[PDB]
Every structure is written in C-alpha cells, then in structure tokens.
Amino acid sequence: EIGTGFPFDPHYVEVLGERMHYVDVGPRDGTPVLFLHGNPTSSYVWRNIIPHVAPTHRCIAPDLIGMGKSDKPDLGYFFDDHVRFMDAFIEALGLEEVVLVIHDWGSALGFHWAKRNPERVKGIAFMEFIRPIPTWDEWPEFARETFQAFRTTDVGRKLIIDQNVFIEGTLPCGVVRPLTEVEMDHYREPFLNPVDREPLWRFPNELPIAGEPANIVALVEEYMDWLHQSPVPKLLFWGTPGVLIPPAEAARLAKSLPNCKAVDIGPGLNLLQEDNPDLIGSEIARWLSTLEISG
Ligand SMILES: [Cl-]
Known part of the structure; x- marks a missing residue:
C-alpha cells in the first residue's frame, strides 16, 4: 500500500522577500539530497520516497514559489522566476555540495542549476524530465490536443485557471x-483559490515544444549539452509508456549520458513516484551508497 499522509514538520525560509x-x-x-518537484505537484510527491533516504542522508524538499505551502506572490511564474527563487532558496539554506533528485519542471531547475554550479553537484537522480520536444508528434498522442489547448491564453486559462x-x-x-480522494485533496489544497492557479497555466506554456518558447528551448538545449559532457553520477528512472520520456529515449539517454544508471519502474506516465515509490526510494538510497565507493 502507498502512503497518503504527509508526516513532515513545516520549515520556512525567507527568499527574496517571500x-x-x-x-x-x-x-x-x-x-544533502535536494528533491525538486514540478507541475502541478509539491513536496507531497516525494512523501513516500524520502523515508528510504532519510536514514542516511539529509532530505530537503522545497515547494516551488507559488506552489505547495510556499508563498503566492502576484507573479507570472515564468521559469525565470522559479530559477531566481530556487537559486535564492539554495543559497539561503547555505547548501554547498548536493545530490539532486529531480522531476518534471523540477528537473529543468535542477539541470540548469547544475550546469551553472557543476562543482557542487555530486550526483543527479532524475525521472520524467524536461527535454526539448522537436515537434508535436514527439509529444504523446493522447495528450497532444490538450496541451495544444493549454498553450493558448483564453481557452488555456479557461481550462487551467477557471x-x-x-x-x-x-x-x-x-x-x-x-489517486485516492485524500491524495487528491493534498494536491488540490494549494490551488483551492482560482487566482492562485497562475503557475499551473504558465508552466505548460513554458514547455520547449516545436521551438517555442525559444528562450526555454535554448536554456534546455544548453543544460542537456552540459549533461552529455558531465562525468557526474546519474540515475535515470523511467516508465512505460511515460510522458516526457518514452522508453526509447530513456534507452538512448542511458547510453549517451556519461556514468548513467537506468531503472525501469514498470508501468508509469509522468508521476512515477506515485506508481512505484518503494523502488524509486530504495534504488536512490542504494545508489547514494554507491557514490562513496571509489572502485
Ligand atoms: Cl507543464
């Protein structure tokens, strides 16, 4: 059975006036092991993974600005904003070296931070992460029409905000x-008020699909280029059929990325943590152990 509770004491830090x-x-x-969630989740997505790691490592899991229990300033919640606030978050806790555990838009944050701080990243575990999507054909069919509608301001905002x-x-x-009703209510809580749903709409509009938005595409291409040339230890979780990362792409990345171990979690779409938390947690913990082995 998969836990529905969130038994973690809240910690707060001031970041750029929020x-x-x-x-x-x-x-x-x-x-420390820094866990970064994406859209439309919170640290809640890590609730059943952290317990596997906490016995041996410090686990830090922030809620992105505008999400979870973090403040909700009147921002556009561009990726830029998230980058700013996460940089400031990491510096506010005085983190030096870290291991990254990252997912979805949290992976874009993690890889972009790593590229800029290569000496401070001692390993990256990732899953269903942001890469460039060259054309819409390489977006899963079943979600193609939806995300095309998301990526408009009238109808997309109607769908996502209203x-x-x-x-x-x-x-x-x-x-x-x-997902159980309890789990749904945890995911719902930060967005009960419609006006607070801005990040949920901007995020899919920031996805690097078919060359747009070009700035994000460029940034993502840059950190993928960095990732392909980095010797940093890597752990890739993937599922079938997946969403952002189909099995073929995972198979390719497992070989093209230096020093990469890949794990098949079985059936999964985007939130792999919700389908097989025990395997992901266990493998992360053991993999963390292997990082201390010289060979
Ligand atoms: Cl998104």
Whole structure:
C-alpha cells in the first residue's frame, strides 16, 4: 500500500522577500539530497520516497514559489522566476555540495542549476524530465490536443485557471494507479483559490515544444549539452509508456549520458513516484551508497 499522509514538520525560509516552505529531515551532516518537484505537484510527491533516504542522508524538499505551502506572490511564474527563487532558496539554506533528485519542471531547475554550479553537484537522480520536444508528434498522442489547448491564453486559462483541469484532469491522468480522494485533496489544497492557479497555466506554456518558447528551448538545449559532457553520477528512472520520456529515449539517454544508471519502474506516465515509490526510494538510497565507493 502507498502512503497518503504527509508526516513532515513545516520549515520556512525567507527568499527574496517571500517565504518558501520545505521538508527537512535526516542527519544534519554529510551531503544533502535536494528533491525538486514540478507541475502541478509539491513536496507531497516525494512523501513516500524520502523515508528510504532519510536514514542516511539529509532530505530537503522545497515547494516551488507559488506552489505547495510556499508563498503566492502576484507573479507570472515564468521559469525565470522559479530559477531566481530556487537559486535564492539554495543559497539561503547555505547548501554547498548536493545530490539532486529531480522531476518534471523540477528537473529543468535542477539541470540548469547544475550546469551553472557543476562543482557542487555530486550526483543527479532524475525521472520524467524536461527535454526539448522537436515537434508535436514527439509529444504523446493522447495528450497532444490538450496541451495544444493549454498553450493558448483564453481557452488555456479557461481550462487551467477557471476549471482547474490540470489538477482534476491532467494530474490523475499522469498516474497509472488511481489517486485516492485524500491524495487528491493534498494536491488540490494549494490551488483551492482560482487566482492562485497562475503557475499551473504558465508552466505548460513554458514547455520547449516545436521551438517555442525559444528562450526555454535554448536554456534546455544548453543544460542537456552540459549533461552529455558531465562525468557526474546519474540515475535515470523511467516508465512505460511515460510522458516526457518514452522508453526509447530513456534507452538512448542511458547510453549517451556519461556514468548513467537506468531503472525501469514498470508501468508509469509522468508521476512515477506515485506508481512505484518503494523502488524509486530504495534504488536512490542504494545508489547514494554507491557514490562513496571509489572502485
Ligand atoms: Cl507543464
């Protein structure tokens, strides 16, 4: 059975005049493990993975600005904004070296931070991550029409802001197993107020698809280029059929990325953590152990 509870004391830190919430558990010494969620989730997505890692490592899991229990300033919530606030978050906790565990838009943040801070990243575990999507044919068929509608301002905002489709529709459709009502309520909580749903709409409009938006495409291409030339230890989780990362792409990346271990979690779409948390957690913990082995 998969846990529905969120048994983590809230921690808060001031970041650029706002307050961000984060999970902070595990020993106080050693290399911390920073967990970064994406759209439309929160640190909640890591709730059943962290317990595998916390016995040996500090686990830090922030809620992105505008999401989870973090503050909700009147921003456009561009990727730029998230980058700014996450940089400031990392510096506010005085983190030096880290291991990254990243997912979805959290992966874009993680890879972009790593590229710019290569000496401070001691390993990256990732799953269903942001890469350039050259054309719409390389976006999953079943979600193609939806995300094309998301990527408009009248109808997309109607769907995502007014009707909360990303939470009620897209979110559970990103999990093979059914989310329980308790789980749904945790994911719903930060967005009960419609006006707070801005990040949920901007994020799919920031996705690097078919060359647009060009700035994001460029940035993502840059950190993928960096990732392909980096010797940093890498752990890739993938599922079938996946969403951002289909099996063929995972198979390619497992070989093209230096020093990369790949793990098949079985059936999965986007929120792999919700379909097979125990395997992901366990493999991350053991893989973390292997990072201390010289060979
Ligand atoms: Cl998105």
